[PDB]
Paper text:
It has been established that [name] acyltransferases catalyze the transfer of acyl groups from acyl-donors (Acyl-CoA) to various acyl-acceptors. In this study, we first performed structural analyses on two representative [name] family enzymes, the Arabidopsis mono-/di-acyltransferase-[name] (AtSDT) and poly acyltransferase-[name] (AtSHT), then explored the acceptor-molecule specificity and potential molecular mechanisms of multisite acylation by structure-based mutagenesis approaches, and, finally, successfully predicted and varified the acyl acceptor substrates of two uncharacterized [name] family transferases in Arabidopsis using our prediction methods on the basis of a sequence similarity network (SSN) and of structure modeling.
Spermidine disinapoyl/dicoumaroyl transferases AtSDT and AtSCT were expressed mainly in the seed and root of Arabidopsis.
Author numbering:
A (entry chain A): 10 to 57, 63 to 103, 105 to 365, 371 to 451
B (entry chain B): 9 to 57, 63 to 449
Write the structure that this text describes.
């Protein structure tokens, strides 16, 4: 009989005056495919000064550095580009909630239904001036433990930026006076052309159709692939083809395996083209590379097109080859600028059954310490945006308390109930 | 009373041979920042029936014609966080210290129960300078009896125990009148270089472990636990009667390591819901293809980790933990596994990420029983009466080290000695568990 009740929502402003300014964003930031809300729960165990008072104070100091987080995002009808008005002005919503259970009856969110996870996550405050891109919630439990939930405009940051923001927040909450990385803006370094005569590539357009779609009985489950299974899939993949000098990554073999199993589960039109989308960091593709204080979107999506027949008939090694080549092309500066141009064309001009995007958030907890008194979250659960979940499979790391899953990977999959049944059975073949 | 060691001189011993002037790269295993610790060991020699200090200085000078990187300077860039070793420049050489003690070897009982702080009186410090530090240093402490302690210090970034043993044996081979080291040494640290995976986030095992209610404390004690061969034999038999181990035999390292883990979880009273991690090292000399030649003295092992909850460690049988320890060893012996472990270390080095997490439940086993099995060390003052490895101060608190007893203790042939560093309260409980 779980009931989570919000007690309060305050608007928290920067601890120092910010001159009124209007900021522009990068081409990657303005990508209307990226106007989704990232969400993550940080689960803290009880202790042997209340956490919400410490975090609220740190948030106000955090906005001294990350003051664009306190502004308002709005897309201009002239540009169809985003504008961020900060300073004087604003503030980040901060919600405190209580739950009528102990943390342990939720297993530290190790198996949380992603709908149920919404009870611990804030939403973005929307207004005349647009929406504030950042929001925080603290849900206190009867054990004395608590969950720190966060929402963040994906137009504002990627996971790298999200990770530094949250760690800076807990660093300040723990007594540090400065964050360890100073944030920069510099979003004009990722600004594209666009090209007047070139029709843009739109991902998911004209992809293979599924006999099960459209439906509205979609289910989200979290699938676990153990380090044992990952090695044996790598071992077998290396025997089909020695990649010689090069090593094959877990993201590559699992990604290819998810693609195959998804195509078969959705029974995609074998003559139709299916498209694997993968994100590739480009922090070091620009010259000079972006500093660590850069927290805007700093990746581009690569796409591997195959027929559903090809995906179903190719070996795993055959697909890894294409995946590896997709990542190599991402590392060319001249390709990056034509990706940027393509995005800008999509913006300036203003279904996908049939399009499969892999997302990687295993690194959500590596960018610094989150200890500010209650010792390093016992679990970090990223929650896939409702806007994209049907297209997305997300790689995430297990709880640090799950000793039997050390070195394993968890994949959040969203499929029609029919397809999901056949999808789990294909994944069984990994063990 | 008290013990007083007086250093008489330190000179930089240079090679008796011309050596190349190079800036050498190190392997991925060598560049691991967790490996930048200083190995130390005391080699005790009794009096003949003065001379030995001078003979080892000449020997060291001849040794550096072969292991000439040892005379270089170690300095890690901040460009790529990689260590570089610069040899053959001006002012190179190995620090070589001669000291005297105001007591006879008899009164320290050949270092058989030496306190680790006392033992530091016989070990050199590593020479630091604007150009970094030398990886290697020697100290000969002369005693009133006529015997002497050969103390050595060795950066783990330079070698593992296999290379350390070959260097010390080459040093005494030379001092004994031989002209060549019996094994020709090679550098080729390029053989063990990882290729970091662009899309693979770094994985640091055992970074965040179960809490101990005794930590943090300043009240740490180090003690040497002795296990005679017949208790080892009795524990092995009992472990065989829990699980039919096939024709797999169970090793002393596995079964005692498992018992050490259980006892340590109990001694430290770790949060039973938390995760405790057992680390062990697995040589990979023959895992790489081509295999490593015997003259390779760089780091040639990978660390394997067994994670469990502190409650599973207490409830599992000894045999249960042995099956897990054997499984870890099987996986380090996969060539493709070692490539990925190499890639992950490279990625850890390059990202230079913040060190975080509770290390209370991290338990790392080292094995230095093999320190004196690579050759003779007679030159001639007769085969050392004792070889005492000293745990790096940087790792002592999460490390238990296996060592062989002195060669003068007949009652302990087949026996094992374990060096244990725990909070004082935990050491009490720990010694009680060791009593069985």
């Amino acid at each position: 009989p779980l009931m989570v009740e919000k007690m309060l929502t305050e608007m928290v402003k920067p601890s120092k005056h910010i001159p009124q300014q209007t900021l522009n964003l990068s081409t990657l930031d303005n990508d209307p495919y990226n106007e989704v809300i990232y969400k993550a729960c940080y689960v803290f165990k009880a202790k042997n000064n209340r956490p919400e008072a410490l975090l609220r104070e740190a948030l106000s100091d955090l906005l001294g550095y990350y003051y664009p987080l306190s502004g308002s995002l709005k897309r201009q009808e002239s540009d169809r580009k985003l504008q961020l008005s900060c300073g004087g002005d604003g503030g980040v919503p901060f919600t405190v909630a209580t739950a009528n259970v102990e943390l342990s009856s939720l297993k530290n969110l190790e198996n949380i239904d992603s709908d149920t996870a919404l009870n611990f996550l804030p939403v973005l405050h929307v207004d005349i001036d647009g929406y504030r891109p950042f929001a925080l919630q603290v849900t206190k439990f009867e054990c004395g433990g608590f969950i720190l939930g966060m929402a963040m405009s994906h137009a504002m940051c990627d996971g790298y930026g999200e990770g530094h923001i949250m760690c800076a927040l807990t660093d300040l909450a723990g007594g540090k006076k400065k964050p360890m990385v100073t944030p920069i803006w510099e979003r004009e370094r990722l600004v594209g052309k666009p090209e007047d005569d070139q029709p843009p590539f739109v991902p998911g357009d004209d992809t293979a159709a599924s006999p099960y779609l459209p439906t509205d009985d979609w289910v989200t489950e979290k699938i676990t692939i153990r380090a044992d299974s990952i090695r044996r899939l790598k071992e077998a993949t290396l025997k089909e083809y020695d990649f010689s000098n090069e090593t094959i990554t877990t993201f590559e073999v699992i990604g290819a395996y998810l693609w195959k199993s998804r195509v078969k589960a959705l029974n995609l039109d074998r003559d139709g083209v299916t498209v694997l989308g993968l994100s590739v960091g480009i922090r070091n593709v620009v010259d000079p590379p972006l500093p660590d204080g850069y927290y805007g979107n700093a990746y581009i999506d690569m796409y591997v097109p195959l027929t559903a027949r090809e995906v179903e008939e190719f070996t795993i090694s055959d697909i890894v080859k294409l995946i590896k080549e997709a990542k190599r092309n991402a590392h060319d500066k001249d390709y990056l600028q034509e990706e940027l141009a393509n995005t800008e064309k999509i913006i300036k001009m203003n279904k996908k059954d049939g399009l499969f995007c892999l997302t990687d958030w295993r690194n959500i907890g590596i960018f610094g310490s989150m200890d500010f008194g209650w010792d390093e979250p016992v679990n970090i659960v990223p929650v896939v945006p409702s806007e994209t979940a049907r297209t997305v499979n997300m790689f995430m790391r297990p709880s640090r308390l799950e000793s039997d899953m050390v070195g394993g990977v968890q994949i959040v999959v969203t499929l029609p109930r029919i397809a999901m049944v056949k999808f789990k059975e294909e994944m069984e073949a990994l063990e």
